[PDB]
Symmetry: D2
């Protein structure tokens, strides 16, 4: 036989473009003197092009290094290496009905999304790229100048590739020098064991802290969606440009007891997830587990929902209701004529956020009461099922 006789693990994938894995210095393709996007504190040199501390500046010193995080629809969030803020088409107006591009914290709003279009010079054949907004009805452009300090804006004044128009020069970017993004290694998958079956009356089984996890999925989260206040902005973006979100399953013990012959016991079974754990996941990732056990995304992470759920191998939630905490008091009777070790597990769905360096930031676990079972020693067909109620 050509393939193994046993199952083998799979590589988890989370493919990204090169521009989503590098912070590039973005230069103007036509500038004679090295001008490109900049984080200069000096003001605009040009009337009708005013700057302030929010402006995305254009200068031939103090360059920005910018990563393009890929959204599910192919647009990009353009994020800065040094302060972790993003470009944002501000709804205010400059002259001539243009909007300034500003630096702002990431919100996931439409105004922070940019479509990259690959184009070029019709005469020379040289390639460059541009950024558009509003379904290609606005283009990003320097304010007036190719070779003086100015600001970046978006304009609705767009020109066709032919006949070539001077103004298009102000929209033409090329990649220059770059820093690599820090990206976690994706773990390999692993198989989940069967729900653990006791081997003797003294086998108390496996506690959640000791249960072997099966790795089932993983996503690379842009750091702009992660709130990790243990780091500052610059360390997060430079050393943890993407965080790892692992999806793992394990059997989570509800309880384990010898139930003597003909005896009743009452046992609390706690499953689902607590509001405390759900509120933590909202705060850290803008995600929570829906009442259908799918993943629900608020606006900050929403733009990456399809990629993240594809990588985790868990579905998008179809309900806005949060999964709740189930706390149920269960009364069990062992009708057998022998003492029986009983143990109940439900499947835990564990999401773990990690830094590039492997540190665990947080885990959040949903105990899935729809996927549970009671195992025992001795067991069927020697004994009859434990009776509930």
């Amino acid at each position: 036989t050509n393939y193994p006789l046993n199952t083998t693990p799979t590589s988890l994938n989370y493919n990204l473009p090169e521009i989503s894995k590098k912070f590039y210095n973005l230069k103007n393709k036509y500038s004679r003197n090295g001008y490109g996007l900049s984080k200069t504190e000096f003001p605009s040199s040009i009337e009708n092009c005013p700057s302030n501390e929010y402006s995305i500046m254009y200068d031939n010193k103090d360059p920005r290094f910018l990563i393009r995080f890929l959204l599910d629809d192919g647009r990009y969030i353009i994020a800065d290496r040094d302060d972790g803020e993003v470009f944002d088409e501000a709804p205010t107006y400059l002259d001539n009905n243009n909007h300034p591009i500003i630096s702002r914290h990431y919100t996931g709003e439409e105004r922070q999304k940019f479509e990259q279009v690959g184009s070029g010079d019709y005469i020379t054949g040289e390639q460059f790229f541009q950024f558009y907004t509003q379904n290609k009805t606005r283009v990003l452009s320097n304010c007036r100048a190719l070779d003086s300090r100015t600001i970046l804006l978006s304009t609705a004044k767009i020109f066709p590739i032919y006949p070539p128009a001077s103004e298009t020069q102000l929209t033409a970017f090329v990649n220059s020098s770059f820093y690599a993004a820090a990206i976690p290694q994706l773990p390999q998958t692993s198989l989940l064991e069967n729900i653990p079956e006791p081997t003797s009356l003294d086998d108390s089984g496996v506690l959640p802290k000791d249960a072997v996890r099966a790795v089932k999925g993983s996503a690379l989260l842009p750091c702009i969606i992660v709130h990790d206040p243990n780091l500052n902005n610059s360390d997060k973006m430079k050393f943890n440009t993407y965080y790892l979100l692992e999806y793992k399953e394990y059997w989570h013990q509800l309880w384990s007891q010898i139930i003597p012959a003909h005896q009743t016991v009452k046992i609390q079974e706690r499953t689902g997830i607590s509001e405390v754990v759900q509120n933590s996941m909202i705060e850290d990732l803008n995600m929570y587990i829906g009442a259908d056990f799918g993943m629900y995304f608020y606006l900050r992470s929403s733009g990456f929902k399809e990629q993240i759920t594809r990588g985790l191998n868990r579905p998008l939630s179809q309900t806005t209701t949060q999964l709740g905490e189930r706390v149920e008091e269960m009364e069990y009777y062992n009708s057998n004529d022998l003492d029986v070790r009983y143990v109940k597990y439900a499947l835990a769905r564990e999401f773990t956020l990690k830094r590039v360096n492997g540190e665990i930031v947080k885990n959040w676990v949903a105990v899935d009461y729809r996927m549970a079972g009671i195992q025992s020693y001795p067991n069927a067909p020697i004994t009859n099922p434990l009776t509930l109620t």
Copy 2:
């Protein structure tokens, strides 16, 4: 130093989902008796569910093996292993305002595009997927039955995950057995030499057949977009599920001559591309080179334009006009007082279609007259430039 002192080649990427790389047997998740999509020649067993030879059938024998080719917008073309036809939402009506899904040759029309949505059972937690059309206003569904021979259709009768509705069962697919797609290996990139400079008066330089190609890009073309009449449907889909389209550049010699001291010569320079070569690329790939030297895609390949151009590293064309053939008669005068070997090259942009087995199906070359040069021995500053006109 941590990185090499020389440049190194890069891997070309063309990432695809697993479902775009496998022909899967698609089974109904709830069927008790093994029913799924089928290529049975037997008719539908059910009134109000009529079948004919175009129907996509549902049966527990003669399964189809279906690949999902990924479109630029995340939708899929669903294509059959055995006959290379695709699923198509026919505009005709069954009862209850539903449309039949039929098998049809690939056109690239909207009616052949399907959105896959990952869902699951709200009670059991078991996962499955569905197919929607028309911006999630129709879902694909068996006609009436889970466990008898019937047809596949699309319906606008969709139900929410909660409360669970019986009818949703008819829409629920899972992957089963599969065959791997045949996929070409992507070549590694290589650097283009400088435009060749003669080393002596007898150096006649390099003819196009002998010029070293630099590999600059590559795309994997679904075979549904390739017309390769040397193969039948079944061989193309099973052994060449994707073709390779390489993008390579080389210097293409226009002419090489010793032009004696103080002598004039007249030389025809042929550049651009011929209509014959453009018509061939249209026929084989539904693509041509635009007058801006970008890539232009007709409807058959249009759905994959962004992925293909990203892989080739050539831009999308912004003009519908075809690149033409330039045939120019040039008159040159060597004003130097010595005999000078002159050679003129322009950059050739070569697209080569290959089978999985490495066979070359076709090459098409656009000679780019915007990127050309005349080199010589002896040369500047010893001689003055050749004068044109």
Copy 3:
């Protein structure tokens, strides 16, 4: 620039042949009826070919699945999937000066090492392989038969490829069906931070449990060299065919204290490694840390020493003396006129043994007193160094 402006992690490599990653059913190339190596409990069918419970049997039922672990010199240890024992050329004699091949626990002795040679049939061109011992002066061969139950032995009766000899048939193996080996994923490397410098007088710095590890190396250990009594033989070989040995470094705090102006303190500094930890590494891996901080290997792991040290990025030890434990009482005086927070770290060299499933079996740490430093707040040039003695 063509390469990043920052350092990037590297993949750790630990390349192995395919036969070292699969347990293959080894069949005789010439047998007409499916005979190959077997774990049959039935006895040899042949006089002068006696079997007992140690014999490696040859039969057409109950096949063995055998992995070939690659030794530093290119020889192989041939190990069984089901019981984890290895083939061994027993020094006892059968008739005709031959030795029986037996199953035995792994020792790493010369008698358990086999040279695989790729050969073939001179007439037909068909390929097969053989196993030799004693620098190709003995070949492994069935005892007498191609197509009856017998034993495996080694013989000094070897024949040249030409003219073809009948007896060579008994030596000719081919690979058949197989199970994949379970192999851990190799971690990516990471950079070690500078020795931590306090930022205030109240910064007590980082305890060993909390120190970030830099991954610097890793080796895949054949499970035959690992003593992991938490598993039985069959689970170890099938689910942990190779263990992972990670090499990581971190800064290990000896102490942290404010030493007030003009005050003396006495502090115990514990470095090196304890005999208890060294004896554990000997028991589990047959390795210890030499007094030169290199790796020392006893016979069980010795055969893989070069591969293991190449993967860990630590050198082979040149001394048989074990690294000892240094327990030193240090007297420090702060001569500065201000209270100074002082902290001392030495570099820890941490070796961690993991299962395929990621569970940590053990860690062993050597605290390297040759690579240590005292940092402080405030620090040079504001203060003078802490004086020792």
Copy 4:
């Protein structure tokens, strides 16, 4: 099912260490002023350390960039980037029974082989490596100096790691800056079709130029073993540091004819390989095909024989006799009562040498008459076999 229902191609592997893939500047670990191995034309600054134009020099200018090609036994050939010559322990004597290390063309002799040993400073913990010859009875060492221009030699004066000896400093190398080796991409494997069967009486079948090759193996050949006089030394080493040797199989047509009912034909069948083709392979690669169809290696390539044959998937030859050319006149009779299209193929074993840029340098083909067949239309059981003789 978990694996495909069809066969899938495999990656060919040819794993190499990092030092075999980079030309490193080798510096002395203890030098205060940047000294290391050098290609300086200036003479040795030191009495008793004479230099000439063959010496491997040691200086702090004009560094060498040296690749270490890995031999089957783990030793290295140390080769220069700029002239493609190798280090060689010359049998002449300096003072004190030492030998000079010289630069020499590659021969594959024992005097050009070096064992790299990873060591370090016993006091500081800093790592470095050394080079030994003659089974670790000589070490490479600077002649006398750490920080003046001198020569490289080998000495039998070796000191233990403990107690540390001054002289060991002269043997201690570290890697510095580097250039990446140019290395070909390894092709993916492909399956060989069945021997082609005609489909009609007019099907004349497939000529060798048109036969589809199955890729079955590949090796990366150090350029020191390849004679490629189309390039100079510097271009070969910098741009083709390794050549690719592909192993491919195809069906090579001996003849195709309609043999009419009851008619005889006489046909020349040419198989094996010509002396002309064997002499070419000897000249270019120092290899030929043995009479057993295995690979035979002369001294220049012998050191890499195991790696090369493992990569090609062809065995080492067990005979010194060259495969010859078989030229046989065959008389065939068609005893059937109908006209039959007959075609005879034998399996061709094709070895193709390629540059990094993909150019084909040469092919050599052995037509294997042991693996041949006559196919026909019509065929068995409709017709009787063609009778030979």
